[PDB]
Amino acid sequence: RKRILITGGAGFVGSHLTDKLMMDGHEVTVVDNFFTGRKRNVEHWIGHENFELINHDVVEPLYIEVDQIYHLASPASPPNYMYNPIKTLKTNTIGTLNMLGLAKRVGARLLLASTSEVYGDPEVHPQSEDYWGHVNPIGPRACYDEGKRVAETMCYAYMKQEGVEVRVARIFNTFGPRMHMNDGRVVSNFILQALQGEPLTVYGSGSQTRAFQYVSDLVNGLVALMNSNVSSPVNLGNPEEHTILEFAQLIKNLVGSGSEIQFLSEAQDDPQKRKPDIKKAKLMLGWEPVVPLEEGLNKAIHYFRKE
């Protein structure tokens, strides 16, 4: 049925988006510069009749007839984006302007992969979509945060001024096969520790909690949101809390490397900074996260074990 463009389609979330859309029957074109993505992520569809992979940086204009654009082209984990603030800004600015220009020209509906970071260090808990956020416009993260903030602004500008149809997802922390293992976040870190024999190290009693979302739940959110009539931003994330200890335990079992878990009773964890309200997504999209933590960790570990 639909002609669909995915920018960043060779990346973590984008490649799983591709899969789903390729299997629902659509004609998918992937645009990606391979700055962080990888051909292995989409290699299964090369050659297939309805797929096209284009090596292309979104800071360059694109002219293609499509019905829908999922705009995920953007550096995503902190080490990648903080190392190149300028490329990060150019991508979120010039690149969003370009994709919105295409969407306007060809009458595509455009969905933006924004981010809970537009909320900054929140002074409201949890964060709903009303919150304006508390964000340093010139810190070392600002290239991503302000970059994604103004990309949201561009969307509504084109919506208000040129009747572009726009969708805005504010994406919270997400995990699974093909994820990046360098956020030094708790799951990537425990998994690496276990996969190579190391002890899993748990601060204090492992009592701080973390809420992560499994990638296929995200991908369902995105598609649900794209095909809805809600044009204001929608948080997509999983607000279920698991203790850090529980992540150690699950990852230990599922890797099965007989790594030990060990406590540093004098050490400590930071409470998670952001926590998504997703009630608007339940109400307007009928969507919730349905993959249990253990199940997503397993599918993830399965990926990384054989890798």
Ligand X SMILES: NC(=O)c1ccc[n+]([C@@H]2O[C@H](COP(=O)([O-])OP(=O)(O)OC[C@H]3O[C@@H](n4cnc5c(N)ncnc54)[C@H](O)[C@@H]3O)[C@@H](O)[C@H]2O)c1
Q: Can you list the pairs that 178-181 forms with residues at least 24 positions away whose Cβ atoms lie under 8 Å?
A: 178/12, 178/15, 178/16, 178/41, 178/215, 178/303, 179/12, 179/215, 179/300, 180/12, 180/36, 180/76, 180/77, 180/80, 181/304
Confirm whether residue 35 is marked as ligand binding: yes
Residue ranges in contact with its own copies by CB under 8 A: 84-86, 89-90, 93-94, 97, 118, 120, 132-138, 140, 142-143, 146-147, 149-150, 152-154, 156-158, 160-162, 232-233
Q: For residues 100 and 151, give the distance between their C-alpha atoms in angstroms, rounded to a whole number.
A: 10
216 torsion bin: left (phi>0), alpha (psi -120 to 50), beta (else): alpha
Q: Please say which residue, 84 or 128, places its beta carbon nearer to its own copies.
A: 84
In the three-class reduction of DSSP (H, G, I as helix; E, B as strand; rest coil), residue 300 is classed as helix
In the complex, least distance from residue 149 CB atom to its own copies, rounded to whole angstroms: 4
Report the partner that residue 34 touches, choosing among its own copies, ligand X, none (CB closer than 5 to 8 A by kind): ligand X
Confirm whether residue 104 is marked as ligand binding: yes
Confirm whether residue 274 is marked as ligand binding: no
Alpha-helix runs per DSSP H in the chain: 12-23, 78-83, 85-106, 142-162, 186-195, 215-226, 244-255, 279-285, 293-305
Question: What stretch of H or E contains 69?
Answer: strand 68-71
Confirm whether residue 83 is marked as ligand binding: no
**Contact call for residues 303 and 175 (beta carbons, < 8 A):** no
Report the partner that residue 74 touches, choosing among its own copies, ligand X, none (CB closer than 5 to 8 A by kind): ligand X
In the complex, least distance from residue 148 CB atom to its own copies, rounded to whole angstroms: 9
Catalytic member of 81, 119, 144, 203:
144
Q: Please say which residue, 257 or 273, places its beta carbon nearer to ligand X.
A: 273
In the complex, least distance from residue 102 CB atom to ligand X, rounded to whole angstroms: 13
Q: Please say which residue, 185 or 204, places its beta carbon nearer to ligand X.
A: 185
Confirm whether residue 98 is marked as ligand binding: yes
User: Among this protein's residues, is 144 annotated catalytic?
Assistant: yes
In the complex, least distance from residue 165 CB atom to ligand X, rounded to whole angstroms: 19
Report the partner that residue 298 touches, choosing among ligand X, its own copies, none (CB closer than 5 to 8 A by kind): none
Q: Please say which residue, 31 or 66, places its beta carbon nearer to ligand X.
A: 31
Structure tokens at 157: 């500008």
In the three-class reduction of DSSP (H, G, I as helix; E, B as strand; rest coil), residue 180 is classed as coil
CA dihedral defined by 209, 213, 81, 20, rounded to 10 degrees?
A: 170
Write out the binding residues: 11-13, 32-33, 35-37, 57-58, 62-63, 72, 74, 90-91, 98, 101, 104-105, 113, 144, 148, 158, 161-162, 174, 180, 185
Catalytic residues: 144
